[PDB]
From a paper:
At the cell division site, FtsZ protofilaments form a highly dynamic, membrane-bound structure, the Z-ring, which serves as a scaffold for the recruitment of the extra-cytoplasmic cell wall biosynthetic machinery. Here we investigate the physiological function of Corynebacterium glutamicum SepF, the only cell division-associated protein from Actinobacteria known to interact with the conserved C-terminal tail of FtsZ. Our structural data revealed the FtsZ-binding pocket, defining the SepF homodimer as the functional unit, and suggesting a reversible β-sheet-mediated oligomerization interface possibly regulated via an alpha helical switch. We found that FtsZ filaments and lipid membranes have opposing effects on SepF polymerization, pointing to a complex dynamic role of the protein at the division site, involving FtsZ bundling, Z-ring tethering and membrane reshaping activities that are needed for proper Z-ring assembly and function.
Numbering used by the authors:
A (entry chain A), B (entry chain A): 65 to 136
Write the structure that this text describes.
């Protein structure tokens, strides 16, 4: 069974849990921050860095509004 | 062998890895943000929330400049 990257269009910092749940279960996540304020985008990236640290994953910047988190 | 909470006096956002390493190994961490700028304190708390989410831990606010992360 294939494990396609989970795409997430973010709406607020509360959606950090959507990236977190998928990544915690072992899925790569690609997320879009273009509907967020500058403040909330920063918050998401910091939360995602904490996810990656905890589970030994890697965060990749695709562009100014698109990042991916990839499991170990 | 006892597992005493790890106290961390933070100096920059780079010290998120000090909270992260201890919490990832299963230690509770109590950290002080009184030497940080407002910007960096926010960044630390968001990174710590990502750590807690990933490993099913809990973050507790002690006061405006002191928080703890506790493993599951």
């Amino acid at each position: 069974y294939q494990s396609t990257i989970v795409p997430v269009e973010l709406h607020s910092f509360e959606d950090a849990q959507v990236i977190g749940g998928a990544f915690r279960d072992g899925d790569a996540v690609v997320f879009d921050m273009s509907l967020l304020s500058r403040e909330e985008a920063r918050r998401i990236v910091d939360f995602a860095a904490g996810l990656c640290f905890a589970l030994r994953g890697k965060m990749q910047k695709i562009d100014s509004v698109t990042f991916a988190v990839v499991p170990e």
